[PDB]
């Protein structure tokens, strides 16, 4: 029901590789990627194989250039589809310090600035109770991205960040 | 990395349809299915589209007839890949009555007979804490099957049963 399309050159030119499911490594099929077409659903694309490296969240739409997904280079070699749970419920707990410690807040809302709403410059642990969320490195959903499926996150490395630099977050809705 | 293959006739004869991901409806491509070949991983196949109707769990291997997966007919039209968490932990809570009520036991092991091990003839609710499990209608892992890839089951209908008929269960391990 879903599919994503990669192109080597800008504005949907050049060789192409299709994926309708979670592709773990296609760097042997594409030397680079400068255009992306998403047909159904929301995908997460990773720089390096096995869902590692930098990641980006691309909902249904067209992306003629690599800046349209706030990308930093034309290197992408893995991708996975984002299954959204049914029920409409979104709920997350964020903690000041590691292992679900420190002062904790719970919210069901997008937060464009954590420093202003919760007075925290960093986040070291997290519990995703309902739905799927994205952590952004900078406020107003700019900077590096990190996907958070559900389960629990004890350290910032568990969602893919070296530093605990997280300043905004929001939910994925289709 | 995984794929499943359906055949219309026995012994891998007839027309063929491949699926590499979660296929929600392929009854228009195959009128019937009598043979199945699974390449890597464990799949769940459903009688009717949109993952409804009777279900069966087929791990990696070959199934020349439809009795090899304890099937009751050659009618299958949807299938899902079963994603196992890489944590090795399997843990389940079973409850006598609905809404996580009644006498409750917790185990991490397969149970070929619930009546003898826990003194229960039925199970009306369930909490899956770690891993993925299968409920079987009869003891010793025979009869109708039910997949449990979630977390919370308040009623027997939530795992796909009209009746609370559960008499054995075991974990899916690859």
Author numbering:
A (entry chain A), B (entry chain B): 5 to 178
Quote the study that presented this structure, word for word.
Here, a simple protein crystallization method inside the features of the HARE serial crystallography chips is reported that circumvents batch crystallization and allows the direct transfer of canonical vapor-diffusion conditions to in-chip crystallization. Based on conventional hanging-drop vapor-diffusion experiments, the crystallization solution is distributed into the wells of the HARE chip and equilibrated against a reservoir with mother liquor. Using this simple method, high-quality microcrystals were generated with sufficient density for the structure determination of four different proteins. Additionally, structure determination from intracellular crystals grown in insect cells cultured directly in the features of the HARE chips is demonstrated.
Via conventional sparse-matrix screens, we identified a crystallization condition for this novel variant and then optimized it for higher nucleation rates. The γS-crystallin deamidation variant structure reported here crystallizes in space group P212121. The mutated sites appear to play a significant role in the crystallization of this deamidated variant.
